Design a protein around this ligand. Structure first.
Ligand code: NA
Length: 461
């Protein structure tokens, strides 16, 4: 991805957009009960903690575009992945406005919380004023579509979240490039059934895990994998995507029956954004921060891995590549060992920066013992080995519980963390609960005991 130009929005007929400058994150009642080192990300140029230009830092993610056209290796990758998706008999029919808005089997309703984007953000109009869960009214939305159309600028927001001290000082805050409600709705009408099919089929055929439930899905992943695992991390995946990857995605869509609306992919590839009082044009790069792009980023990841394997290992049998992606995150396997370091080298030529899995200093063999997916390790249950626990280390959980964004959601926040932590074992879980109950706020919470969670897990299969 590359920024073509940037300048005063006024010069191009757009208004100044107002975005919060103060974090909603504040120390929680557990701030001194647990260890942690993360702080709220810098949200403005004037933040005292900054040690470099903020504007430069947040847009440095656009490293440029390494490739223009789709080569022969990418074409083969497209043919193989598209052929694989064809086995799912995905309904190519457009989804009606109602379901696209309020959800249906395999697709959740629009998030009434998130931004409505332009121009609604500048008109002070919220989603709550357009959508009616109880009525499932599409009248209002339909008139807004007719009035403002599609292909609207994306509203850029800085993400309010915890970051390491280094990322804070270097102003390395992540961004949210919100699509207008109009575009979000139009894209779900065009691809709604595709989204539903992926959400309903997490695994090695879709090569996707979006919409998955780790508590249950972890037990299914191992049997789908080939003998030798391989993985790696990407540095700034979304922003690094070159225009060629978007063209390869359109080819996949065309082959599976959506050639009808590949134009929507262009909107993601060549897009314009509004940030504060400026407007800018980007070539390449997947608009980041929102879930609406999770599926497309996952599909593209399937194309990238296939391409690098074909380019690095002529004669590779893709029918035996078994991988599952969630955006840029991935767990993959093949019957034979492969060299991730070599694959990373090939990746540079395609505009991708690949590094050792889980932040290792060197590319080491990936095993069921050290592999992680969505930050969770895999651990067989002591009593029932066939049941696999998704294990997220307590470090991140401890980092999270030390801050709060709303005193009213304290119990939901802590309960969600408990659902993650108990997988670490009864001993660790009880220590976690004991510390929570060492302060008044914690003692007033209704939290599940270990045996209660273990029983509920067994009863969920
Ligand atoms: Na873009």
């Amino acid at each position: 991805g590359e920024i073509q130009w940037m300048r005063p929005s006024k010069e191009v007929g757009y208004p100044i957009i107002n975005a919060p400058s103060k974090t909603k994150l504040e120390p929680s009642a557990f701030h001194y009960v647990f260890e942690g080192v993360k702080e709220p990300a810098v949200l403005t140029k004037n933040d005292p903690r900054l040690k470099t230009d903020f504007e430069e830092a947040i847009f440095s993610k656009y490293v440029g575009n390494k490739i223009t056209e789709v080569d022969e290796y990418m074409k083969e990758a497209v043919d193989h992945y598209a052929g694989q998706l064809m086995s799912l008999d995905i309904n190519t029919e457009q989804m009606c406005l109602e379901d696209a808005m309020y959800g249906t089997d395999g697709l959740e309703a629009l998030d009434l919380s998130t931004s409505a984007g332009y121009p609604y953000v500048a008109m002070g109009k919220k989603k709550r004023d357009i959508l009616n869960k109880q009525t499932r009214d599409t009248k209002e939305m339909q008139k807004l579509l007719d009035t403002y159309g599609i292909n609207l600028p994306l509203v850029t927001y800085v993400k309010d979240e915890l970051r390491s001290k280094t990322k804070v000082e270097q102003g390395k805050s992540r961004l949210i490039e919100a699509s207008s409600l109009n575009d979000s709705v139009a894209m779900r009408m065009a691809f709604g059934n595709l989204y539903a099919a992926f959400h309903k089929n997490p695994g090695v055929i879709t090569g996707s895990a979006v919409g998955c439930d780790p508590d249950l899905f972890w037990s299914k992943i191992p049997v789908l994998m080939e003998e030798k695992l391989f993985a790696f991390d990407y540095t700034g995946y979304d922003a690094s995507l070159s225009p060629a990857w978007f063209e390869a995605l359109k080819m996949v869509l065309e082959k599976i029956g959506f050639g009808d609306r590949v134009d929507y992919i262009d909107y993601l590839n060549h897009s314009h954004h509004l940030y504060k009082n400026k407007t800018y044009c980007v070539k390449g790069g997947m608009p980041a921060g929102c879930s609406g792009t999770s599926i497309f980023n996952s599909m593209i990841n399937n194309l990238i891995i296939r391409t690098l394997l074909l380019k690095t290992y002529k004669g590779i049998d893709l029918d035996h590549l078994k991988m599952i992606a969630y955006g840029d995150d991935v767990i993959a396997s093949y019957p034979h060992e492969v060299d991730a370091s070599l694959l990373a080298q090939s990746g540079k030529d395609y505009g991708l920066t690949m590094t050792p899995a889980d932040k290792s200093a060197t590319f080491e063999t990936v095993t069921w013992e050290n592999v992680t997916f969505l930050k969770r390790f895999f651990r067989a249950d002591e009593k029932y080995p066939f049941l696999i626990h998704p294990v997220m280390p307590m470090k991140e959980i401890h980092e999270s519980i030390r801050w709060t964004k709303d005193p009213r959601n304290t119990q939901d926040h802590v309960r969600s963390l408990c659902l993650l932590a108990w997988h670490n074992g009864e001993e660790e879980y009880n220590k976690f609960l004991a510390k929570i109950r060492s302060v008044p706020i914690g003692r007033a919470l209704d939290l599940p005991e270990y045996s209660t969670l273990y029983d509920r897990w067994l009863d969920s299969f």
